[PDB]
Design a binder for this molecule. Structure first.
Ligand code: TRP
Ligand code: DST
Length: 355
């Protein structure tokens, strides 16, 4: 009945799929409740605490599973830690920053990169659609990896490009902005905080009407990923035959920068919002397991994860599987990520057709 109790039940069942110990599970359920603030105790019969863009039903939680061949998926959870402040973006941002800085203190990492950007991303009268989200990578040992997501449009959508250009300059990535491919918008900037082999600055780009061929040409990273693999992923995720475009909710690309010498990204991820291109989650699950099997990943663990989040039949709604992503990063194996919704407030109805 309370938001924190649904969310921590779902997290608990997901930690089991990910193979985390009881100790680490208990740790991370605590962290999730702390991240929700007063909203953790909010009855689910009341409206969401904010009209957050984090999920379609405004649950301020979303999970994701990152798959590699030969092992269990890695589990991650995305939260709006200022959600208890509601829809006032300045107050929601201030509360979210306070949560991240509490995490940084607790786990002993620096926020200097974030702090350098604060005035760009947290102006006095910010514009939507978000102020601050946080994702936690739920690593064995109970000390998570921390990622923060900021709004390039905070100073107005017309200033998003300028804001991203300035952020990249402040972080020392003076060639990165001009390395990005063209796009239709800059919806997010994200930072890896804390202990990472190579922490990334991540720039997210929106592409309206992307085709399969476009999905394989948009990488800017060195070395370039396989075009054929990207095209096939896009076709499978959108159910496009071998014209065909994703002209509803747009596909996004993410370009990651981890070192400043090359001037080039070290990563590219293609994100397909599959929820807008299926009749129901049985179709989205079928597409997700097709991608997983193509890349020699553990699709039965996805099936277990879906049942961990929700007991409903997959065909009784749409939006449980929010996004599918194919992830390339320099010197790392290709990874597939599935983003799974909490559906604490609504189950969107199934569709008779997808036009
Ligand atoms: N729900 C938002 C943000 C979001 C949540 N999970 C995501 C995964 C990938 C990309 C964006 C997102 C959107 O649809 O854009
Ligand atoms: C939450 C949003 C905006 C995007 C999801 S991309 P991500 O941060 O999950 O990507 P990684 O798994 O960190 O590469």
């Amino acid at each position: 009945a309370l938001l924190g109790d649904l969310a921590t039940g779902q997290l608990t069942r997901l930690c089991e799929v990910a193979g985390l110990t009881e100790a680490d599970t208990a740790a991370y359920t605590g962290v999730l409740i702390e991240s929700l603030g007063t909203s953790a105790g909010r009855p689910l019969s009341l409206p969401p605490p904010s009209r957050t863009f984090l999920s379609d039903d405004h649950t301020p939680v979303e999970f994701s599973l990152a798959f590699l061949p030969g092992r269990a998926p890695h589990l991650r959870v995305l939260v709006e830690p200022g959600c208890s402040s509601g829809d006032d973006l300045a107050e929601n941002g201030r509360a979210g920053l306070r949560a991240v800085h509490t995490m940084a203190d607790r786990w002993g990492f620096s926020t200097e990169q974030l702090d350098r950007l604060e005035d760009l991303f947290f102006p006095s009268s910010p514009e939507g659609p978000l102020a601050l989200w946080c994702a936690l990578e739920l690593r064995s040992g109970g000390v998570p990896g921390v990622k923060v997501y900021l709004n390039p449009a905070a100073n107005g959508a017309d200033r998003a490009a300028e804001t991203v250009r300035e952020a990249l300059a402040r972080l020392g990535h003076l060639q990165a902005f001009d390395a990005l491919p063209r796009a239709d918008g800059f919806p997010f900037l994200a930072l890896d905080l804390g202990d990472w082999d190579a922490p990334r600055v991540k720039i997210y780009l929106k592409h309206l009407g992307m085709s399969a061929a476009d999905a394989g040409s948009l990488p800017r990273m060195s070395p370039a990923p396989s075009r054929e693999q990207l095209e096939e992923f896009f076709r499978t995720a959108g159910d496009l035959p071998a014209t065909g475009r994703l002209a509803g909710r747009p596909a996004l690309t993410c370009h990651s920068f981890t070192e400043t010498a090359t001037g080039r990204p070290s990563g590219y991820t293609l994100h397909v919002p599959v929820r807008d291109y299926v009749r129901h989650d049985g179709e989205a699950r079928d597409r997700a397991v097709a991608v997983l099997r193509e890349h020699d990943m553990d699709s039965a663990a996805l099936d277990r994860a879906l049942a961990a989040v929700s007991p409903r039949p997959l065909s009784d709604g749409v939006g449980l599987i929010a996004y599918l992503a194919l992830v390339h990063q320099r010197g790392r194996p290709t990874r597939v990520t599935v983003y799974v919704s909490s559906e604490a407030y609504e189950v969107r109805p199934p569709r008779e057709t997808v036009p």
